[PDB]
Write a protein that binds this ligand. Sequence first.
Ligand code: NI
Ligand code: NI
Ligand code: NI
Ligand code: NI
Length: 399
Amino acid sequence: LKLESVVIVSRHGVRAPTKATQLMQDVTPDAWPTWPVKLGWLTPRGGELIAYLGHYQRQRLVADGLLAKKGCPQSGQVAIIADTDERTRKTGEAFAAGLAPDCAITVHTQVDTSSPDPLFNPLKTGVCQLDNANVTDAILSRAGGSIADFTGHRQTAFRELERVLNFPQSNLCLKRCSLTQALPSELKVSADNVALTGAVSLASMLTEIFLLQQAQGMPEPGWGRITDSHQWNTLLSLHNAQFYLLQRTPEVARSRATPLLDLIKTALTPHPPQKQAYGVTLPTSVLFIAGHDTNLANLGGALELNWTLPGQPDNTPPGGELVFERWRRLSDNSQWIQVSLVFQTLQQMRDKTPLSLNTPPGEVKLTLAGCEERNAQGMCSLAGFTQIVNEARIPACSL
Ligand code: NI
Ligand code: NI
Ligand code: NI
Ligand code: NI
């Protein structure tokens, strides 16, 4: 099998919290540790971790014969697209720096940096709209039938989070007991967005913040109250759970992932090279796309890619990569698509461990669950991939 093309959909790297709310203060007696950069921005450490994945990918791709061992990749051979957020732009820069240091690979973004890019979510620019009644029913059904059913099955994790927070001594509690009841969680479904209020979204946010502390190398994440891998896995199930509901549900995911699906399909299809989105010439050898956890999850649910990540409690971790490869099978020159999730384990983030062929990131081989035409290695034919993308995408959400 000869590797011919690769498209990497990456979450941005380690970032500071996006917000600092009063509710965050009220649910713990302890002080949240401060971060070295503005709200939502990538930390220098964040950048360093992504650059390790770049270095790893270069080694790996050199071994696969796709990129040369010495020198800068030839022009256009590597392309990088990034959302307009500081944190995604800087993730792009960091990945280029690890992959091809001193080659100054351009990090492309949309023309306008101060407005949202619909490639990363077409709902947010009103390219298309969710069907309210359908999405409501679909998400409630995925929750176990109600949001009360959903929190009912996760009581243990909520109580783990309360322990870490010391929620019983918190201001909310002293006035008045439990997160899921003190903060009732409701599904809010609008034309451009689905959201959960209350305990479910607070829990998803706070547990991700603990993970980021750990990954940032902070001395005592969770005020020192998170002391083993079972606790990490337990805490982060609340994050994963909200994403299961709000981002993986196909009635949301398909719409929200549609421009990325078109871009990925374009990048992976043999075709004469041609300047398109962002003035990037496609197809080419490597395309790196720097976005958001939501994007990873939206693709996963649109494409019926399922995973959990061993040693990495967040299913959609900082720098986690959804890797699409086109491989040519030499026996009959047929074309095949492989999909994988490449990620640093939490310990690899915590120890800032340099990545390499002998010390690789974790990796989970995925299967496209709708694919009818599969090879021995679990890859989906190009034609099978193509049909899956065509059925999954929502035309009204295309750019
Ligand atoms: Ni964004
Ligand atoms: Ni149930
Ligand atoms: Ni350019
Ligand atoms: Ni995540």
